[PDB]
């Protein structure tokens, strides 16, 4: 049966991919997003040296990097701009990730709490937050400054990553940051699923964050020789002699499947089972254990109640290590061997070949790739493995290394089944089992839009306009779009409302608002009785309600949709202000 935990929303920010849609495009095109160290971060010429193991140097100069990790919208989160400057970028980016995930799920803060609270006991929490992270590097800058100047305070609390989200969301569930290194994100998901199953909270936000903000990490992988000579993760490829670090922030909104189905939530997939263990005493602290990996994979399978023969795809750890890669396959082989003797039926690959080793966030990026493959029914290439690692025999294995884009066909009406592994360098292992889900036309709707100020509002109109021009959208989607923007967004200061019945009309109105030109009739803008107006709107006269709402009137939009409720759909998230904050702000040179 499984623990039946539904995924009702997701957000992701990965190298070369500001959002999940872009991430899929990169994955589909087999794009390599690895680059050299951005000059803005630090002067890497002070540390680079091609000779392995040189003291005070590093032979790696590559990485999977995000763009503008110092960009943040503190006013949006009720954080003072002064506080933002000394606040760990990981906390900042996870805050923005958390919000985007709620918007993808089609939930406002208040709505999410209400939906969660109804499913658990009185004194049980509503929303839980489980974050995975392993580095506190921002802290180091403050110390480097304080020694040769005036002492500056730069906090290094990993708990803040989860705690600030809980604070912002007004969440009352468990608020936990976990560190199991590379397996952190998957460990967070594991604990989140356990909390939901146990009834500790109604919904749970689970994810991971990992940034490369300091050169120290590179001096470390250089000394320990963990870094690859070519700055690539050759997942199961020949010549892989280490990994390349990558940046990333991701999260999922988790919920018991029954509750999601009953609430008409989007369902991006279902977590059937999770498992967590440790490699024990191997021949070295950072030496992986194939038997432990096999055990955690089987444990997740048993908890999921699945038949491993049906597994269509495995998203592997695949860091591109001399010892690690063959060990991982050995672990997987031992796992499958306890159930079937079948060969070459399962696909395998790693996103790390695309975006690098995201470490504490590797699992959430991996989950994204897996869910996206199922969503589009397409298996994506795994890079840097034109010739496979000589130590690995895929011919005598359950697997076939995915090296070309290919269709992932559904067997009958049976859900596509996938597996996801993440193995911490310190020995902590994790495996997650997921499967996908199987389940007023033409009328005038009222499309609503709000943001912090006028500029952000017109920005939202533009991004929504650009989205609704894509091929997937038609006029038949208008009831879903309107519903999502009503009950799935926060009613903010600057507001925009328009009554439309066709999609091209909505696009025109959005374009007008975005460009600040003249608005049509039935459209209302504001830079910043209900019972009567809602009855009117339910009778097909929504203009007085829309105009009143734009003027600032609070509106319980749910009252409008009490035959069948429209579907929540994926719409563009809030356009955060991109102002730069760093610890050197205000400090003398």
Site for Cl ion in 444-503 (CB under 5 A): none
410 lines the binding site for Cl ion (CB under 5 A): no
Q: Which helix (H) or strand (E) covers residue 419, if one does?
A: strand 417-423
108 lines the binding site for Cl ion (CB under 5 A): no
The correct pick among 52, 109, 440, 567 for binding Cl ion (CB under 5 A) is 109
Site string for Cl ion, 62-101 (x = CB under 5 A): ----------------------------------------
Burial code (b: 16+ CB inside 10 Å, e: under 16) for 433-464 equals bbbbbeeeeeebbbbbbbbbebebbbbbbbbb
Q: Toward Cl ion, which CB reaches closer, 108 or 229?
A: 108
CA distances from 20 to 3, 73, 97, 261, 364 (A): 26, 21, 12, 23, 12
Least Å distance between CB 169 and Cl ion? 8
Please tell me whether residue 64 adopts helix, strand or coil conformation. strand
Whole-angstrom distance, CA of residue 584 vs CA of residue 589: 8
Q: Toward Cl ion, which CB reaches closer, 168 or 339?
A: 168
44 lines the binding site for Cl ion (CB under 5 A): no
**By CB under 5 A, how many residues form the interface with Cl ion?**
1
Q: Toward Cl ion, which CB reaches closer, 334 or 558?
A: 558
Report CA torsion sign: 409, 411, 416, 418. negative
Site string for Cl ion, 4-33 (x = CB under 5 A): ------------------------------
Site string for Cl ion, 305-334 (x = CB under 5 A): ------------------------------
Burial code (b: 16+ CB inside 10 Å, e: under 16) for 108-146 equals beebbbebbbebbeeebbbbbbbbbbbbbbbbbbbeebe
Q: Toward Cl ion, which CB reaches closer, 107 or 226?
A: 107
8 A C-beta contact, residue 63 and residue 245: yes
Least Å distance between CB 127 and Cl ion? 12
Q: Toward Cl ion, which CB reaches closer, 117 or 214?
A: 117
8 A C-beta contact, residue 260 and residue 384: no
Q: Provide the greatest CA pair distance for the chain.
A: 76
Q: Toward Cl ion, which CB reaches closer, 109 or 403?
A: 109
Q: Toward Cl ion, which CB reaches closer, 313 or 451?
A: 451
Least Å distance between CB 76 and Cl ion? 13
538 lines the binding site for Cl ion (CB under 5 A): no
CA distances from 553 to 108, 245, 339, 533, 538 (A): 17, 49, 61, 11, 18
Q: Which span (104-112, 200-208, 318-326, 576-584) binds Cl ion, by CB under 5 A?
A: 104-112
Whole-angstrom distance, CA of residue 292 vs CA of residue 299: 10
Whole-angstrom distance, CA of residue 364 vs CA of residue 444: 40
Least Å distance between CB 463 and Cl ion? 23
Q: Which span (107-115, 122-130, 310-318, 328-336) binds Cl ion, by CB under 5 A?
A: 107-115
Least Å distance between CB 116 and Cl ion? 14
The token pair at 400 is 């076939």
Q: Toward Cl ion, which CB reaches closer, 140 or 491?
A: 491
Residues that bind Cl ion (CB under 5 A): 109
């Amino acid at each position: 049966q499984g623990m039946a935990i539904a995924i009702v929303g997701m957000a992701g920010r990965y190298p070369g991919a500001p959002d999940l849609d872009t991430f899929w495009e990169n994955l589909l095109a087999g794009r390599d997003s690895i680059t050299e160290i951005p000059a803005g971060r630090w002067d890497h010429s002070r540390y680079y040296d091609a000779r392995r193991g040189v003291p005070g140097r590093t032979y790696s100069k590559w990485g999977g990097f995000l763009d503008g990790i110092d960009e943040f919208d503190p006013l949006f989160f009720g954080i003072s701009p002064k506080a933002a400057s000394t606040m760990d970028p990981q906390e900042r980016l996870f805050l923005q990730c958390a919000h985007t995930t709620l918007e993808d799920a089609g939930y406002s803060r208040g709505a999410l709490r209400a939906a969660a609270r109804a499913r658990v006991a009185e004194d049980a929490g509503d929303i839980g937050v489980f974050a995975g992270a392993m580095y506190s590097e921002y802290q180091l800058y403050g110390a480097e400054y304080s020694v040769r100047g005036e002492p500056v305070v730069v906090p290094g609390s990993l708990a803040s990553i989860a705690n600030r989200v809980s604070y912002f969301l007004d969440a009352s569930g468990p608020s936990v940051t976990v560190d199991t290194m590379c397996a952190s994100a998957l460990s967070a998901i594991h604990l989140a699923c356990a909390a939901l199953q146990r009834g500790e909270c109604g919904v749970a936000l689970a994810g991971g964050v990992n940034l490369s903000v300091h050169p120290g990490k590179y001096l470390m992988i250089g000394e320990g020789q963990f870094a690859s000579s070519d700055g690539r993760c050759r997942s199961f490829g020949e010549g892989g002699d280490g990994y390349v670090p990558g940046e990333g922030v991701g999260a999922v909104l988790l919920r018991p499947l029954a509750d999601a189905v009953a609430d008409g939530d989007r369902i991006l997939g279902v977590i059937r089972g999770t498992a967590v263990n440790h490699g024990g005493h191997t021949h070295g602290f950072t030496v992986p254990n194939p038997l432990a990996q096999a055990a955690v994979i089987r444990s997740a399978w048993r908890r999921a109640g699945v038949d491993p023969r049906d597994i269509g795809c495995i998203e592997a750890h695949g860091t591109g290590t001399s010892l690690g890669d063959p060990i991982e396959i050995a672990g997987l082989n031992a796992a499958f061997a306890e159930f079937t003797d079948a060969r070459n039926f399962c696909a395998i690959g790693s996103a790390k070949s695309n975006i690098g080793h995201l470490e504490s966030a590797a699992g959430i990026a991996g989950l994204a790739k897996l869910l996206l493959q199922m969503r589009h029914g397409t298996l994506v290439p795994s890079l840097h493995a034109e010739r496979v690692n000589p130590d690995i025999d895929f011919a005598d294995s359950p697997f076939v290394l995915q090296r070309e884009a290919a269709p992932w066909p559904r067997t009958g009406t049976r859900p596509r089944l996938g597996g996801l592994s993440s193995f911490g360098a310190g020995g902590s292992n994790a495996h997650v089992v997921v499967e996908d889900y199987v389940e007023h036309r033409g009328e005038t709707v009222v499309v609503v839009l709000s943001a912090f100020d006028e500029e952000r509002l017109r920005e939202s109109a533009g991004r929504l306009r650009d989205a609704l021009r894509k091929e997937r959208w038609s006029s038949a989607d208008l009831p879903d779009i309107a519903y999502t923007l009503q009950v799935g967004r926060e009613a903010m200061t600057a507001r925009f409302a328009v009554a439309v019945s066709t999609l091209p009309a909505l696009v025109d109105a959005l374009d007008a608002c975005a460009l600040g030109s003249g608005l049509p009739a039935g459209a209302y803008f504001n830079p910043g009785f209900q019972e009567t107006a809602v009855r009117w709107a339910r009778r097909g006269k929504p203009a007085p309600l829309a105009e009143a709402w734009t003027s600032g009137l609070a509106v319980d939009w749910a009252r409008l949709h009490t035959g069948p409720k429209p579907r929540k759909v994926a719409l563009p998230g809030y356009p955060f202000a991109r102002e730069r904050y760093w610890y050197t702000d205000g400090l003398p040179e």
